[PDB]
């Protein structure tokens, strides 16, 4: 997997405009939808139990985010995940806060038991509670245990499936000043999984394309601030090119 | 109905700052409120059953949007609609997704039975499931059946009441890249219905003013992207003038 | 309390990046989080009963906003407030709409009975229903009755604790065109209470710093509109300096 192939995946996403069903928290629904629209995907945000099953089945990917949990939204997420599983739609999980509060950890473990996942994206603590050289081993152990793809996020991202491991070096710290920046990335990974057969490559391509857009947006923002960055990021998800990804994406097979 | 009269309606909205009660989905509440504030209206977003009745009764217009449905929010919408009906407050419905999932279609038909509507805005499929020359006939048939105003949206908008039909030619494709752009338009139609006696003229004036602002915003955005467009659209809802509407609104009586 | 000391509080907030737990309405959650991130604080938006207690206990401040009430979210707010009270975490209340509808007034009075508050921020009507020279007396009467700090907002803000009263003269009218601008201010007051021992000084420092950032943002926005202002405000919460606060904050002890 390289920058050249990641660029090709970004073009496939724009070409097909995949329907990406996201069940996420209310602090980031609007931004998640706008980021996906800018990227070139088709967002669908239904979250109620009376319809999530019908939505998930026709989507290109289902993304579950436990940011602002509730007993009911977790149940809807599982109903959606089971429907997605029945119809061969890939499911991506973002176990936000797993290990921080008991309810989050329980909900994350619940989903892992009831839904087969194509990929899980979270920080080291979140992945451990739900499931460097130490980060690489954690990613490999979890990927092998759940027979899935694990993307442990940080300034350096470690992605692993049952047999391979990669480190990615893209992005900008300004992403930490925009709420939903991480949540949107997991949905972008979903958009890529909807067009790329292998979830490991989809994830690498997704994280790389997003990090490049974020870097280019930060360059333009200069010292304007986090408000301008938020708008520039949406602009760059739309204007970032294959050439930009080939030139700035840093993908390393370990 | 013409561009000159539509411009006059826009000035009336700014003058009176109508209280527009919107019960909409969580992906677009913030944008809907901000668009209405920019336009010069007063948004009120209460959605809970314990208060929607009290809110609707003092509003200038009530707008119902079924974007991210739930059994409870539909019930609140009907409670609000009945209250609005009792106090002579016009009710506008946006039956998003009607015909796509069973639950949406059911909920839309439910509202149509329980609440008298001043106007319904949706795409062709949505209007048909809830209720060119073929689009014109659909709008006329539905307007006559429900004794209401039907605004079928597309690149060309077809608006009809029991006896008249109009086609409108305004707007920009960038609206498709901003979540809530359509939802906000239905609430803007509500803002216009709050000041214009005839719901057909209110709708025409609303859609025209919004399309002109969208075109002017797209000109300014140039090739910046969907992030800049979102911000420019809010800017133009605020700065668009009567002169702009007279010069760029395309209204045709069929 | 002066502009020089208010500036020092702003630096303390940036230094410590306080965890500010906000339980607010869905129209303003994203903006509240982004404003706090821009300011230099750490927002946490959990609102479900199964976890709010665990969140509140580790936060630097808890802020309750009754904007889009529901029987359940009020109960969660009280659970969170009691947890905050047990662990010495300051609680700030924004009784939006108190006195406008019966349900709001009831909910506000409920919170006042069950949760000890460090500060309450609202307009004159809201403070009266929940609890010039006349505004000053209202603030003093309410502050003395509830043994708390009362910040009555307007173009001129009146802040009072059991024994002192201050008037603040900062801000810009463009704040009225951005949904969540007021709601975000109450959360900013929370961010300041998390680092400043005396809630009266924290509130004065918070409102002053926010008003200065708002004025500077309005200068930059010029005649661009409310969309650009929203983005500029976020920019200025990030870039406003101690020097800016010393030069533009107007604080008067009555």
B129: tokens are: 């499931």
- Cα distances from B246 to residues B182, B186, B196, B223, in angstroms, run 23, 21, 18, 26
Question: Which chain A residues touch B225 with a CB distance below 8 Å?
Answer: 38, 234-236, 238-239
For Cα atoms C130, B31, B126, give the angle at the middle one, nearest 5 degrees.
Answer: 115
- Cα distances from B220 to residues B10, B49, B210, B216, B224, in angstroms, run 21, 42, 15, 7, 9
Residues A97 and A198: their CA atoms lie apart, in Å, by 27
Token pair 């938006």 in the structure block, residue: C45
C106: tokens are: 């009831």
Residues A245 and A240: their CA atoms lie apart, in Å, by 8
Continuous segment of H or E residues that includes residue A73? helix A71-86
E-strand spans in chain A? 19-23, 42-44, 61-65, 91-94, 119-122, 149-152, 157-160, 165-168, 251-253
| Nearest residue in B to A22, CA atom | B27
Range of the domain at A91: 1-254
Q: By the 8 A CB rule, do B42 and B18 touch?
A: yes
For Cα atoms C107, C112, C116, give the angle at the middle one, nearest 5 degrees.
Answer: 140
Q: Using CA atoms in the order B92, B25, C24, B188, what is the torsion angle rounded to 10 degrees?
A: -40
Count the Cβ atoms, other than its own, within 10 Å of residue C199: 21
Continuous segment of H or E residues that includes residue C42? strand C42-44
Q: Per-residue b/e over A91-129, b at no fewer than 16 CB within 10 Å?
A: bbbbbbbbbbbebbbebbeebbeebebbbbbbbbebbeb
Residue B98: phi, psi to the nearest 5?
Answer: -60, 125
Residues A231 and B230: their CA atoms lie apart, in Å, by 9
Q: By the 8 A CB rule, do C167 and C156 touch?
A: yes
Q: State the angle between helix axes of B71-86 and B102-114 in degrees (0 to 180), rounded to the nearest 10.
A: 20
Residues C151 and C159: their CA atoms lie apart, in Å, by 4
Token pair 């989905």 in the structure block, residue: B25
Shortest Cα distance, chain B CAs vs residue C233, angstroms: 13
Residues B26 and A28: their CA atoms lie apart, in Å, by 10
DSSP state string for chain B? --HHHHHHHHHHHHHH--EEEEE--TTTHHHHHHHHHHHT-EEE----TTTHHHHHHHSSEEEEE-TT--HHHHHHHHHHHHHHHHTT--EEEE-TTBTTBHHHHHHHHHHHHHS--SEEEE-HHHHHHH--HHHHHHHHHHHHHHTSEEEE-SSSEEEE-SS-EEEE----GGGGGSTTHHHHHHHHHHHHHTT-SSHHHHHHHHHHHHHHHHHHHHHHHTTS-HHHHHHHHHHHHHH--HHHHHHH--EEE-
DSSP state string for A10-41? HHHHHHH--EEEEE--TTTHHHHHHHHHHHT-
- Which residue from B100, B102, B155 is spatially nearest to B125, judged by alpha carbons? B100
Which residues have a Cβ under 8 Å from the Cβ of B138 and sit 6 or more positions away? B124, B127, B128, B152
Identify the contact set of chain C against chain B, taking CB-CB distances under 8 A.
Answer: 25-28, 30-31, 67-71, 101-104, 176-180, 223-228, 230-231
Task: Give this entry's resolution in angstroms.
Answer: 1.5
Q: How many domains does chain C have?
A: 1
B10: tokens are: 């826009």
| The pairing of beta strand C157-160 with beta strand C149-152 | antiparallel
Continuous segment of H or E residues that includes residue C119? strand C119-122
C6: tokens are: 């208010």
Continuous segment of H or E residues that includes residue A210? helix A199-221
CB contact under 8 A, B50 and C28: no
State which approach was used to obtain the coordinates: X-ray
- Which residue from C27, A80, C120 is spatially nearest to B31, judged by alpha carbons? C27
CB pairs under 8 A between A and B: 75
Q: State the angle between helix axes of B181-193 and B29-39 in degrees (0 to 180), rounded to the nearest 10.
A: 40
Residues C44 and C32: their CA atoms lie apart, in Å, by 10
Identify the contact set of chain C against chain A, taking CB-CB distances under 8 A.
Answer: 26, 29-30, 33-34, 37-38, 43, 45-48, 50-51, 54-55, 230-236, 238-239
| The pairing of beta strand A251-253 with beta strand B149-152 | unpaired
Neighbours of chain A (3+ CB pairs under 8 A): B, C
Residue C22: give its domain's CATH number. Answer: 3.40.1190.20
Residues C200 and C1: their CA atoms lie apart, in Å, by 9
Which residues have a Cβ under 8 Å from the Cβ of B18 and sit 6 or more positions away? B41, B42, B59, B60, B61, B191, B194, B195
CB contact under 8 A, A102 and C26: no
Residues C89 and C33: their CA atoms lie apart, in Å, by 19
Continuous segment of H or E residues that includes residue C19? strand C19-23
- Cα distances from B9 to residues A198, B156, B192, B198, B233, in angstroms, run 55, 21, 7, 11, 19
Count the Cβ atoms, other than its own, within 10 Å of residue A134: 8
B52: tokens are: 């929607």
Composition of chain C by helix, strand, coil, percent to 5 = 55, 15, 30
CB contact under 8 A, B50 and C68: no
Residues A92 and A94: their CA atoms lie apart, in Å, by 7
């Amino acid at each position: 997997m390289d920058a050249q192939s990641a660029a090709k995946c970004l073009t496939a996403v724009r070409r097909h405009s995949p329907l990406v069903h996201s069940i996420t928290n209310n602090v980031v629904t609007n931004f998640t939808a706008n980021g996906l629209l800018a990227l070139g995907a088709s967002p669908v945000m239904a979250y109620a139990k009376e319809e999530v099953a019908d939505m998930a089945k026709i989507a290109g990917a289902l993304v579950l985010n436990i940011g602002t949990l509730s007993k009911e939204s977790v149940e809807a997420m599982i109903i959606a995940g089971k429907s997605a599983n029945e119809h061969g739609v890939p499911v991506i999980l973002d176990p936000v806060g797993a290990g921080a509060t008991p309810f989050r950890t329980e909900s994350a473990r619940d989903i892992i038991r009831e839904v087969r996942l194509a990929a899980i994206r979270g920080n080291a603590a979140e992945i451990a509670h739900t499931v460097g050289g130490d980060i690489i081993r954690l990613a490999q152990q979890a990927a092998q245990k759940l027979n899935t793809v694990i993307a442990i996020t940080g300034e350096v991202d470690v992605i692993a499936d049952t047999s391979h491991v990669y480190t990615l070096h893209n992005g900008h710290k300004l992403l930490t000043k925009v709420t939903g920046a991480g949540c949107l990335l997991t949905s972008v990974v979903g958009a890529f999984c909807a067009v790329e057969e292998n979830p490991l490559f989809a994830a690498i391509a997704a994280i790389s394309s997003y990090g490049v857009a974020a870097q280019l947006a930060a360059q333009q923002t200069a010292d304007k601030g986090p408000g301008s960055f938020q708008i520039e990021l949406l602009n760059k998800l739309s204007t970032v090119t294959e050439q930009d990804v080939q030139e700035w994406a840093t993908i390393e097979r370990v």
